[PDB]
Each structure stands twice: as C-alpha cells, then as structure tokens.
Amino acid sequence: PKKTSFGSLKDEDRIFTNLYGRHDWRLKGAQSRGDWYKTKEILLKGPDWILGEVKTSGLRGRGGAGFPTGLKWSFMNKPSDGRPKYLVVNADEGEPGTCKDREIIRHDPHKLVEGCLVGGRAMGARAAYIYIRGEFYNEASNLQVAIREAYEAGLIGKNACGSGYDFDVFVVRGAGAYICGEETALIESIEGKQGKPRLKPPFPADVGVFGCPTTVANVETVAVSPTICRRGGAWFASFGRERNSGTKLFNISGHVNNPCTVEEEMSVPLKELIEKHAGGVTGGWDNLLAVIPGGSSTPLIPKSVCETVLMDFDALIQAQTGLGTAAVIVMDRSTDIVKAIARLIEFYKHESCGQCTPCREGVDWMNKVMARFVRGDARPAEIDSLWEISKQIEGHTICALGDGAAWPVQGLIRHFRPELEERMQQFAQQHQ
Amino acid sequence: EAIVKNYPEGHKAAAVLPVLDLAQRQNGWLPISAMNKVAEILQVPPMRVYEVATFYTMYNRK
Amino acid sequence: TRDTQLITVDEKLDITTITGVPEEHIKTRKARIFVPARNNMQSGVNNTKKWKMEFDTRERWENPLMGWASTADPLSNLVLTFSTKEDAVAFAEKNGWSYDVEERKVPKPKSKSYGANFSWNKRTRVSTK
Ligand SMILES: Cc1cc2nc3c(=O)[nH]c(=O)nc-3n(C[C@H](O)[C@H](O)[C@H](O)COP(=O)(O)O)c2cc1C
Ligand code: SF4
C-alpha cells in the first residue's frame, strides 16, 4: 500500500476534534470526546513504554524546530540526583502567521493538561509549568479553569488519576516578547529575568529551569501525546510520508478567501490544502504570487514551486524553506512583495533581545537596508551586500531568532531579485 | 502569596513578572515606586526589576 | 674539528673596560630584569612574552625656556629584549651592571563553566545576563 497521496483526513482520525469550540470545552464535554480516558493505565505502563509510543509514532516537534520528540524526551529518562525535574509547555506562540496553539488552549484545554501528565510521567517530572504569552489573557484563564477541574477530579495533583504519581500543572503568563518562545529564553523568563536565550551546552535536559533537568515542548506536541498512547504509535505513524508522520494543525492566512485554522494530514500538497479548506487564493490560483509556508521565520517560495510542493518537513527543505509552525501565509499578485518582507524584518528588529552582536546590530542593519529597498533608494550592488550580511548573521548568533531574521531576506533575494532591481531603476530615473 | 508558592523555595525571584504585572493591574501603570515595592517584597535588587520592567512591552512605565 | 689552535681561559667574562661606558654609569646603575606586566586596559598578552632590561629612573627637570623635560641620564630610554631570564642576566654580568631579577608571573588556570550561572542551589547563580 504506502499511500503515496496524502490529505483528505477523515473526521474520525482527527485529534483536535473541538478545534472550533462548538462542543463544550470543560471537563464534562472533554471526557465525552475521549480525553482523560484510561489515563491511569497509561501511567502504570511506565516511562519506557510511553517513550516507546512517542518514538514509534515518529512525532516531531511542532514548535518549528521539528526534532524527533521521542528522542528529545528520552534525555529526561535518566536516574535522578538531588534536583527535581520539570516539563515546560511552550504556549508562547508568537510567530507571525501562527495561531494554532491558541485554539488548543481555549477549546481543548483538557488535552493539554493530559499531555502534561502523560508527558511529565514519561520524563519523571514533578510538575509542568505552562508558559502562555501575556496577550492570551482569556485563553490562559480557560486553561486555568480546566486545571481546577482536573485537580478537583483527582486527574492531576496528589495521586494523579489514581496511579500513585504526584504531578502539578502550573500556568505562568508572559509579559510580551516573541523571544521568550525560544526554549532557553522561556526558561530565563520563568526564572524572573529578561527573556534572553542561554548558550548550549549545557542543555536543558541537564541544566534547565531553576537549574534542574527540564524539557521544553510545544503546546501541540504535548497535546497530541496522550492520543498517541491510547491509539498507539503505529496509528499516528500511518499518516504522511516516512519521517514526516501524523496529523498537523495548519493556519491559512493572508490572501485567501477563507482564512482558517484546520487539521490535515502531513505531506498534503500545499495547493490542495489552500484550495479545499481556505477557499483558494484570492482571485484564483493564477493570481498567486508567493507563500510563506511556515510563519515569518521561513523563506517565501514563488508560485512555480507552490504548484507541487508538499507540506512536510523534508519536502519543504528541498524547496529551500521549512515547515516551521506550518502557518501558511498567502500573498496574491497585488501584494508589494518587497514591502511584505520589509515588515517582517521590522518585526524581528523589534523582537531581538539585544544580547548578542550579530542580531543586535545585524538585524537592525537589515531593517535599515530593507526600508530603502522598498523605496528603491539604493543601487543594485547593495542586494549582494544584503545577502552577505544575512550570512554573517546566520549561524553566528546565540539563538535561532537571528537565523529567522536572515531567511526572510534570503528568500526575497533568491526569487524576487528582478523585482528589487526593477524598483531601484524607477527611483533612479525619478531623482537622478 | 499564592503566586510566590508556585516556585521552589529559594527561588522567589521567579515571581517578578507575575507580581510586577499585579502591580500594573491594580494601578494601571508601573510608577518607579511600584517597581521599588516589588523589589522589597521579593527581595531582589531593584535594578533587576527595572531590567524586567523595560524588557517586556506589556508593562506601562507611563 | 677546528684547525685554528685554541686556548683556555678560566676567568669570568667581563667587558666593562672595552664597552666604552663611563665609570659612573656602570657602577651606580641598577638594571631591572623583568617580564613587563600586561597593560590592564587591554586583554592582549603579546607584550608579556619577552624579558626586558631597564635601568633606574633618574632626575627629569623642567627646561627653563619652554618647560620641556630635561634629563642628564644617558641610559634613560635604553631597553633591551631577551628570550630567557638567563640571557638577560648573562648580558648584565658581562657588562658589570648590578641587577634585580623578577620571576615571570603567569595567570593560573581558571575553572570556567557556563552552566554554573544557572546553579540549582549554589551562589554562583547569576541574577542577570
Ligand atoms: C525566536 C524563537 C521563537 C520561538 N517561538 C516558539 C513558540 O512560540 N512556540 C513553540 O512551540 N516554539 C517556539 N520556538 C521553538 C522553541 O525554541 C523550541 O524549539 C520548542 O519550544 C520545542 O517544542 P517542540 O519540540 O515540541 O516542537 C521558538 C524559537 C525561536 C528561536
Ligand atoms: S540572536 Fe537575537 S534574540 Fe537570539 S540571543 Fe542573539 S540577540 Fe538575542
């Protein structure tokens, strides 16, 4: 068999079945859809069995880095010393174009809470701190209420699910910072400091929050793990190509008729995703210009690549981009493609933490140059200068925010160079 | 008190962000005397609260 | 090996009488042999590699006409560079100069750990980055 075509996920194979909040999000409704079912049996299997299901499912981090979750969660499966261990759920979701983690929190809070317990059990963690951006004040409150219902029901807290395992789930609100979504910068924010990433090593599995073994995992990665244990790793691994398994939450925004969050199979064609769910590109497929396929951090691709690209980690890598958060942004032919990307570099210049030189000075530099390419106020040689600057930033910074400031620039220079050189021509003839 | 008991003993400083935001919710904005007070309660140097206050954008210093 | 017919000399080498130096600046001068200390304003350690020989500082006064700094010490600006403490001492002895030697100072190896900044229960935990 090995279905070589993907998509058309059936409503019975969807995990986040309350994505649209048309069913009750509280505990009573959640249990009616499968949540908190046989959780005691899962916990009594143990961490080795749980980590077995995560590995077999081929689940990969949904936070944008896309690492193998099963291998990542296994660094915490080591004998303890004097320190406690923690699970940090990353609910920051600051990436432009991304809004999937918001839905999970306010429409399926109990899936996240059960993921924390199951995931925390696998890693030997004594508690889970859920870090949710400060702007999501109503979504955090919903989660805080669901946390109360779980406490009162014996599902978490002392003797969680009756399994003799003690677990805590804390909610901590951010205070406004896209950089706190970075795993180490999140930890420093929980500890009460500025959200500035740490250098690695040490790795959070060895030295994390409060100086203790920690694993930082995305909201979506945690939220699906209990289902993978109930339904098995093999079921999850039955979707998508090889090394690209599972369902995936997609946001489709920008210039589509029906912007929407939606669940769909991994490795579905990008066109099929946009057309069937989002209602097509505004003004028809032939009005398409370029798509940012995974939030601002990833390079944009043109209409030619968009014809036959699949939405998975490896298919987009060979397109010179990345799946990222899978936040598809569509830009139609009326968009000022230079001005769209200039506003992204302005976003990064506003988010850089300032800690390390290449991004503190470089991204601010690329912002000034892009501001001029929008007006055409430059000469063509500055395009290759901007390319070189972006390479001096990439791979030289402390964290990946620097890399994600460069890739938008490299995408624009890679595919729309004539657009840049064309706009420089007009400014010259007008002023000379 | 409930906020501070969310963190290990010996790591009260982790309450700087929530407690500092609680000052803003009570008062609407963070005057210098509000940050000086959160420094007293959590017993962290005031300069470490000024760093937090100016780093994050959800805090209003005017 | 050698064809020229050598000779034996057991006397210690001294050249004070053929150097041409005045008597005053041989007998009454104290030569300092040291490795210069690192300039504390900078971090480079390239100027702490060689041994130096310098003499004692002497009177510098103000020139009555323009206020410039006058001197009467011919050896005020003389500085010699040596590879080893033994070469420097060897040079001074054959020139008859009294000298001090100061042992080279070397920063001891430090134990640097990035992970210490985030210790669970130690005082090395940093309050800022
Ligand atoms: C600037 C920056 C922002 C990030 N923001 C998020 C985020 O909002 N949510 C998230 O899950 N991961 C974010 N990440 C990725 C995290 O560092 C980390 O890879 C992720 O929390 C791991 O989750 P996962 O393994 O479950 O995918 C960000 C990374 C960087 C460099
Ligand atoms: S790359 Fe930017 S955001 Fe990341 S540590 Fe360096 S300055 Fe801070």
From Swiss-Prot, chain A:
Binding residues for FMN: 173-221
PROSITE patterns in alphabetical order: COMPLEX1_51K_1, COMPLEX1_51K_2
SMART domains registered for this protein in UniProt: NADH_4Fe-4S
Modified residues (N6-acetyllysine): K55, K78, K349
Obligatory cofactor(s): FMN; [4Fe-4S] cluster
UniProt entry keywords in alphabetical sequence: 4Fe-4S, Acetylation, Electron transport, Flavoprotein, FMN, Iron, Iron-sulfur, Membrane, Metal-binding, Methylation, Mitochondrion, Mitochondrion inner membrane, NAD, Oxidoreductase, Respiratory chain, Transit peptide, Translocase, Transport, Ubiquinone
GO cellular component: mitochondrial inner membrane; respiratory chain complex I
Keyword Glycoprotein among record annotations: no
Membrane topology: Peripheral membrane protein
InterPro entries linked: ComplexI_51kDa_subunit, NADH-UbQ_OxRdtase_51kDa_CS, NADH-UbQ_OxRdtase_suF, Nuo51_FMN-bd, Nuo51_FMN-bd_sf, Nuop51_4Fe4S-bd, Nuop51_4Fe4S-bd_sf, SLBB_dom
Cofactor note: Binds 1 FMN.
One of the protein's GO biological processes: mitochondrial electron transport, NADH to ubiquinone
Assembly: Core subunit of respiratory chain NADH dehydrogenase (Complex I) which is composed of 45 different subunits. This is a component of the flavoprotein-sulfur (FP) fragment of the enzyme. Interacts with RAB5IF.
Family, as annotated: Belongs to the complex I 51 kDa subunit family.
Protein name: NADH dehydrogenase [ubiquinone] flavoprotein 1, mitochondrial
Source lineage: Eukaryota, Metazoa, Chordata, Craniata, Vertebrata
Curated annotation (Swiss-Prot), chain B:
Subunit field text: Core subunit of respiratory chain NADH dehydrogenase (Complex I) which is composed of 45 different subunits. This is a component of the flavoprotein-sulfur (FP) fragment of the enzyme.
Gene Ontology CC annotations of this record: mitochondrial inner membrane; mitochondrion; respiratory chain complex I
Gene name tied to this protein: NDUFV2
GO biological-process terms attached to the record: mitochondrial electron transport, NADH to ubiquinone
Name of protein: NADH dehydrogenase [ubiquinone] flavoprotein 2, mitochondrial
Residues of the full protein shown: 64 to 125 of 249
Superkingdom per UniProt: Eukaryota
GO MF assignments: 2 iron, 2 sulfur cluster binding; metal ion binding; NADH dehydrogenase (ubiquinone) activity
Assigned keywords, A-Z: 2Fe-2S, Acetylation, Electron transport, Iron, Iron-sulfur, Membrane, Metal-binding, Mitochondrion, Mitochondrion inner membrane, NAD, Oxidoreductase, Phosphoprotein, Respiratory chain, Transit peptide, Translocase, Transport, Ubiquinone
Coiled-coil region: none
Cellular compartments annotated: Mitochondrion inner membrane
Role summary: Core subunit of the mitochondrial membrane respiratory chain NADH dehydrogenase (Complex I) which catalyzes electron transfer from NADH through the respiratory chain, using ubiquinone as an electron acceptor. Parts of the peripheral arm of the enzyme, where the electrons from NADH are accepted by flavin mononucleotide (FMN) and then passed along a chain of iron-sulfur clusters by electron tunnelling to the final acceptor ubiquinone. Contains one iron-sulfur cluster.
Broad class of where this protein is predominantly found: mitochondrion
Stated family: Belongs to the complex I 24 kDa subunit family.
UniProtKB/Swiss-Prot annotation, chain C:
Listed name of the protein: NADH dehydrogenase [ubiquinone] iron-sulfur protein 4, mitochondrial
Domain of life of the source: Eukaryota
Subunit-structure text: Mammalian complex I is composed of 45 different subunits. This is a component of the iron-sulfur (IP) fragment of the enzyme. Interacts with BCAP31 and TOMM40; the interaction mediates its translocation to the mitochondria; the interaction with BCAP31 is direct.
BP-aspect Gene Ontology terms: brain development; electron transport chain; mitochondrial respiratory chain complex I assembly; reactive oxygen species metabolic process; response to cAMP
Family statement: Belongs to the complex I NDUFS4 subunit family.
Keyword terms: Electron transport, Membrane, Mitochondrion, Mitochondrion inner membrane, Phosphoprotein, Respiratory chain, Transit peptide, Transport
Region (Disordered): 103-129
Location within or outside the cell: Mitochondrion inner membrane
Free-text function comment from the UniProt entry: Accessory subunit of the mitochondrial membrane respiratory chain NADH dehydrogenase (Complex I), that is believed not to be involved in catalysis. Complex I functions in the transfer of electrons from NADH to the respiratory chain. The immediate electron acceptor for the enzyme is believed to be ubiquinone.
Cellular component GO terms held in the UniProt record: mitochondrial inner membrane; mitochondrion; respiratory chain complex I
PTM characteristics: Phosphorylated.
Membrane-protein topology: Peripheral membrane protein
Part of the full-length chain shown: 47 to 175 of 175
Gene Ontology molecular function, alphabetical: NADH dehydrogenase (ubiquinone) activity
PTM annotation (Phosphoserine): residues: S127
